[PDB]
Design a binder for this molecule. Structure first.
Ligand SMILES: *[C@@H]1O[C@H](CO)[C@@H](O[C@H]2O[C@H](CO)[C@@H](O)[C@H](O)[C@H]2NC(C)=O)[C@H](O)[C@H]1NC(C)=O
Ligand SMILES: *[C@@H]1O[C@H](CO)[C@@H](O)[C@H](O)[C@H]1NC(C)=O
Ligand SMILES: *[C@@H]1O[C@H](CO)[C@@H](O)[C@H](O)[C@H]1NC(C)=O
Lengths: 213, 182
């Protein structure tokens, strides 16, 4: 088990006070949130890497650090003080700029061992689902569930003819537990002379999963 | 080939609740988060545990700074609050629902802040407190949050479920509804 690094949080300095900027409340319970996201953007593994730190106060993002810039940039006036306070600290800037390596790249290397390579195969099953009066558009449902990563193509073929219209989907759906699912339905009126096929392609598979109806 | 991925280190401190959070995210999923109080690393999936390690103290230290920063922010904005943003609740089963075959129910809470809520599962109007679990507050692209609540269950015609979500940005609790459909 190799240690995962992280970005050390910097201290803000009191002093100034900005004219009552963004208002809000209207009765709602007054809350105060300090929130920060440090994002490691891998455009192709550690080959291309961009670190993006974003500070938020309540509902507004106010301060930012795009590694491509090398300095903190205020997004709203609320965060300028910090921009000025930290950018004038030549020491700090170096520490941050280097985190793209000592943290982003550092961690990715680790993560490339079990996360990047992770693969869970989908489960495909087609089926109709509506009352039988057929006073709608007999929705042919193609369920591709329990798969990872998200990347996936779910195509419908009516008599070898790819249905490029009438396809109602939920889109990709995140389960929160490192697994996805999706529903690509097809509006049509079934006929024992037509064969609708649901093709499914995805990194875990080796050969497009074909299901018929 | 080409591996595009994004790792996020999301963290926050909230008042007055005095709640803190420190978590890592991979391509949208939680890798792990730290139990601030019990000072320990909780992996989203158990398996992840043998492939790496994280020093939870690291997170606490950070939350300290975060907590402090919050005060400067309050002192800098003259304690001006903002509105609360109520969540969108969605309930869907984790897998295709087959009768008598054990499945899971996912309550999806999204687009909201502050990062706090009270969630309750209802099996036939009866609160469920077993076979349930929840994720911590998850980062979104913007400034809001999303969350997940899970309920283990056994599909049966005679049953109906409800996910009740309460958030300060709501007048009355939101009660989404899920009932077996074939
Ligand atoms: C992305 O970076 C990878 C390095 O991880 C580059 O390498 C891959 O592609 C090479 C040829 O293009 C192969 O020689 C390598 O085997 C393969 N991965 C390895 C093991 O290095 C890749 O070229 C880069 N891709 C892009 C889009 O630039
Ligand atoms: C800060 O807000 C309070 C009310 O919330 C107001 O009374 C006070 O004048 C403000 N502080 C100043 C003087 O900027
Ligand atoms: C949530 O529940 C807590 C107690 O568990 C309570 O103090 C708080 O007011 C509730 N928040 C709301 C109304 O969403």
């Amino acid at each position: 088990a190799d240690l995962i690094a992280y970005l050390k949080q910097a201290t803000k300095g009191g002093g100034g006070s900005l004219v009552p900027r963004g208002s809000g409340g209207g009765g709602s319970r007054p809350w105060f949130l300090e929130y920060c996201k440090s994002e490691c953007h891998f455009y192709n593994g550690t080959q291309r890497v961009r670190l993006l730190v974003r500070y938020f106060y309540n509902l507004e993002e106010n301060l930012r650090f795009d590694s491509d810039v090398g300095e903190f940039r205020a997004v709203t006036e609320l965060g300028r003080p910090d921009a000025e306070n930290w950018n004038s600290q030549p020491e700090f800037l170096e520490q941050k700029r280097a985190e793209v390596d000592t943290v982003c790249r550092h961690n990715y290397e680790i993560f490339d061992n079990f996360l990047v390579p992770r693969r869970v195969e989908p489960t495909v099953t087609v089926y109709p689902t509506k009352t039988q009066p057929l006073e709608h558009h007999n929705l042919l449902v193609c369920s591709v569930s329990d798969f990872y990563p998200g990347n996936i193509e779910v195509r419908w073929f009516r008599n070898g003819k790819e249905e490029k219209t009438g396809i109602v989907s939920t889109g990709l759906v995140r389960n929160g537990d490192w697994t996805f699912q999706t529903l690509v339905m097809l509006e049509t009126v079934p006929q024992s002379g037509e064969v609708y096929t649901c093709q499914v392609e995805h990194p875990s598979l080796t050969d497009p999963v074909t299901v018929e109806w | 080939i080409k591996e595009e991925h994004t790792i996020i280190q999301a963290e926050f401190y909230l008042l007055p609740d005095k709640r803190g959070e420190f978590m890592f995210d991979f391509d949208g999923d939680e890798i792990f988060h730290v139990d601030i109080e019990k000072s320990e690393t909780i992996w989203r999936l158990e398996e992840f545990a043998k492939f790496a390690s994280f020093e939870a103290q690291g997170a606490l230290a950070n939350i300290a700074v975060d907590k402090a920063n919050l005060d400067v922010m309050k002192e800098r904005s003259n304690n001006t609050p903002d509105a609360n943003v109520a969540p969108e609740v969605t309930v869907l089963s984790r897998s295709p629902v087959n009768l008598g075959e054990p499945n899971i129910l996912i309550c999806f809470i999204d687009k909201f802040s502050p990062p706090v809520v009270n969630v309750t599962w209802l099996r036939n109007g009866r609160p469920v407190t077993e076979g349930v679990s929840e994720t911590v507050f998850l980062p979104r692209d913007d400034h809001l949050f999303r969350k997940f609540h899970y309920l283990t269950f056994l599909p049966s015609t005679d049953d109906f479920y409800d996910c009740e979500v309460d958030h300060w940005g709501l007048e009355e609790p939101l009660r989404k509804h899920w009932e077996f459909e074939e």
